[PDB]
Scaffold this active site. Structure first.
Site, mmCIF file in Angstrom:
data_model
loop_
_atom_site.group_PDB
_atom_site.id
_atom_site.type_symbol
_atom_site.label_atom_id
_atom_site.label_comp_id
_atom_site.label_asym_id
_atom_site.label_seq_id
_atom_site.Cartn_x
_atom_site.Cartn_y
_atom_site.Cartn_z
ATOM 1 N N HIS A 195 0.807 -1.217 0.000
ATOM 2 C CA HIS A 195 0.000 0.000 0.000
ATOM 3 C C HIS A 195 0.843 1.272 0.000
ATOM 4 O O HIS A 195 0.314 2.387 -0.014
ATOM 5 C CB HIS A 195 -1.064 0.002 1.103
ATOM 6 C CG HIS A 195 -0.551 0.311 2.479
ATOM 7 N ND1 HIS A 195 -0.596 -0.606 3.507
ATOM 8 C CD2 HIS A 195 -0.053 1.451 3.015
ATOM 9 C CE1 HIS A 195 -0.127 -0.054 4.613
ATOM 10 N NE2 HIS A 195 0.214 1.192 4.342
ATOM 11 N N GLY A 244 2.679 6.184 9.806
ATOM 12 C CA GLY A 244 4.026 5.960 9.299
ATOM 13 C C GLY A 244 4.710 4.731 9.897
ATOM 14 O O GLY A 244 5.812 4.368 9.489
ATOM 15 N N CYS A 270 3.744 1.679 9.496
ATOM 16 C CA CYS A 270 3.578 0.497 8.602
ATOM 17 C C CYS A 270 4.907 -0.032 8.140
ATOM 18 O O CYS A 270 5.853 0.755 7.892
ATOM 19 C CB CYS A 270 2.694 0.853 7.401
ATOM 20 S SG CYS A 270 1.006 0.898 7.939
#
Lengths: 4, 306, 301, 4
Positions: free
Chosen positions: C41, C143, C145
Site C-alpha cells: 500500500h 508511518g 507500517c
C-alpha cells in the site's frame, strides 16, 4: 541478599 | 493509536555485552572502547561474598585470571583496577561497536530499559522504573549480574544501571556506572532488605496526561486542589509526596493539554477515593506508575533514534 | 526472580530497517540480503485507498519510482514484484547486517516482539500476543507500517509479522512475511472490524505457573476439575476452550511446580467465579494472557 | 480501517  | 510500555531499541547496547570469568564465576561485562566494566564480585566464589575484602582479593588477581569473551573471541586483558563496586578491565582491543555514550546516575522514579544478559549473550529487554525505595522490580536469574540499564537520546546511550544483586523480596539492587550503589545496599551476601516502597505520583500524573492526550478524559473534573490538600489524601494511599519540583516537571504536559497540574491532582484525588467505577484508563484498570513525563512526550511525539 | 513483559533484543532487526518512499508516501521496509520487503500500500494514492487495484497500480510503476533509503543513503532499486500484500524490491547492494533468519506464520495466541519504526528508524520495542481474532493490541502511529514482529532462537531471527493497518477499535492488523494477512482483513480503507476476541486460556494458566515459580500461591485450592467442567465455566467468561493438547503443553511447568494441570484449572475456575478480592498475582490485578508456556519457561527457567 |  544474593549476588546475582 | 494504542499505548504500550516500550523499551528502547537494544542494538547499541547488545554490541557492548561481553562475558567475564574468574575461575568458576561468570557474569556479564560492558565493553566500551578499551575498557570492560563488571561487578567487582566476579572475583569471588560461593562463599567469598559473605564478607570479602575486595581490596585484598584483587591484589592477588592477575590480568590472565580474567577470561573476557566477546562472542567467539577472547579479549586479552592488559590491566585491572577497582572503582567503587565495579572492576575496570583494560583490554587490548577497542570495541568497534562502541556507541556514543555517557554514564548518568538517575533519580528515583525515573525509568530505563534493561538488557537482561547471561554468559555475555543478551536474552531480553524490558522497561522499568527505579523505585522510590531505590530497588528495581526486575526479572533476573543466576548469571544476570553485569546486565545494564540505559536510556537513549538521539544517538547517545546514557548508561544508568548495572545489576549486582537480588534482595529477599525478589527485587533488585545495583550501581550506576561509577560503581556507586543506588540505595544503602552493599555487595555482600549479608542480610539486607528493601525498605517500604511508595507509588510514583509524578509518573501516575504523567500517565493521566498521556491518557488525556490519547482521548481518554472521563476522569477530568471542574475542580482543583492545593498541593498540601492533595498530599494529605495521596499519602493515605501510599503515594509519594508531590513537590513543587514535580509540578514543574509536569509543565510541558500541562501546557500541551491546557490542564493545570493541580487540576489533574483533583482528578487523581477523586480516582483514589472513589476508584474507577468500572471504566478503564488507557485500557488499564489500575493507575500506572512506570511512565515518566519524558516517556510520555517521547512516545506521543513518535521520537526515533539514530 | 521477578516477571516482566520482556521483548527479544532488537539489534538484529534494527540493522535491517530501511525507509521506502513512493511519491508522497513513506513507510518502513525490511532489508535482507539484496531484497527489501514492505507493505504494497506504499504505492497507493490518497483518494485511492478506498478501493485500490494493486495489479493496476503496480504496472504503472518502474524500479526508479521507488526511493529506498538506509538512513541517509539511497539504495538503487533494480527489480520489483508483488507477493500477496507485500512488495519485494531488489536493490543493487547487500545488507551485511542481515542476520540468520526465516519467515514464519504464527498461530493466534503466540507472542512476538515488535520493533516500532518511523521513517526507517527504530522508536521502541515491545512484546505482544497475536489475539485469537488475529489483531494485535499494539502502539502504532501514522508511518509505522512496515514495522515487523519477530522472535529470536539463538542467532536466528524468525520474522512473523509486518504491520499494515489500524482498525476502528484502535487495534492493529498485518501480514506474515509472505504477505498473507492474519485474519479476514484486506489492505484497503473500508469498514472492517475485529472479530469477537477471547482470553487466551493456555497463556493465563502458564502465567499462574509463573507466579507459583515465583512464590505467589494464594490462589491455589484443594480441588481438581475435569477438562469438560473447566470449559463449561471458562467459556462463560469469554475464555478460549482448553484442549488436551494445551494440557499437554503445560506438562513441563506442571512437573517443575508439582501442581497438576487440572488442579491449576481448578484454581483458575475459582478466580473467575470469585474474582481476586483486591489481591494481586505477579504484581497484577487482572489475569494476564500474553505470556505463552514457552515464555514462562524461558524467563523463569 | 486506516493503512498505517
Amino acid at each position: 541478599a544474593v549476588l546475582x | 493509536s494504542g499505548f504500550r510500555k516500550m523499551a528502547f531499541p537494544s542494538g547499541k547496547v547488545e554490541g557492548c555485552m561481553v562475558q567475564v570469568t574468574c575461575g568458576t564465576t561468570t557474569l556479564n561485562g560492558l565493553w566500551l572502547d578499551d575498557t570492560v566494566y563488571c561487578p567487582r564480585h566476579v572475583i569471588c566464589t560461593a562463599e567469598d561474598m559473605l564478607n570479602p575484602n575486595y581490596e585484598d582479593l584483587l591484589i592477588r588477581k592477575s590480568n590472565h585470571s580474567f577470561l573476557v569473551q566477546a562472542g567467539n573471541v577472547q579479549l586479552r586483558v592488559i590491566g585491572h583496577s577497582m572503582q567503587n563496586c565495579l572492576l575496570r578491565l583494560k583490554v587490548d582491543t577497542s570495541n568497534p561497536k562502541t556507541p556514543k555514550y555517557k554514564f548518568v546516575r538517575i533519580q528515583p522514579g525515573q525509568t530505563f530499559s534493561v538488557l537482561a544478559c547471561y554468559n555475555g549473550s543478551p536474552s531480553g529487554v524490558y522497561q522499568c522504573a527505579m523505585r522510590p525505595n531505590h530497588t528495581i522490580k526486575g526479572s533476573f536469574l543466576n548469571g544476570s549480574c553485569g546486565s545494564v540499564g540505559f536510556n537513549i537520546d538521539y544517538d547517545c546511550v546514557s548508561f544508568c544501571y548495572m545489576h549486582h544483586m537480588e534482595l529477599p523480596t525478589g527485587v533488585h539492587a545495583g550501581t550506576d556506572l561509577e560503581g556507586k550503589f543506588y540505595g544503602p545496599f552493599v555487595d555482600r551476601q549479608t542480610a539486607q532488605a528493601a525498605g517500604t516502597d511508595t507509588t510514583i505520583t509524578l509518573n501516575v500524573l504523567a500517565w493521566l496526561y498521556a491518557a488525556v492526550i490519547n482521548g481518554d478524559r472521563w476522569f477530568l473534573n471542574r475542580f482543583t486542589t492545593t498541593l498540601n490538600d492533595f498530599n494529605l489524601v495521596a499519602m493515605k494511599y501510599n503515594y509519594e509526596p508531590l513537590t513543587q519540583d514535580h509540578v514543574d516537571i509536569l509543565g510541558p504536559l500541562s501546557a500541551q493539554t491546557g490542564i493545570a497540574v493541580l487540576d489533574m491532582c483533583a482528578a487523581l484525588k477523586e480516582l483514589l477515593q472513589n476508584g474507577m467505577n468500572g471504566r478503564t484508563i488507557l485500557g488499564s484498570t489500575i493507575l500506572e506508575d512506570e511512565f515518566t513525563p519524558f516517556d510520555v512526550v517521547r512516545q506521543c511525539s513518535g521520537v526515533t533514534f539514530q
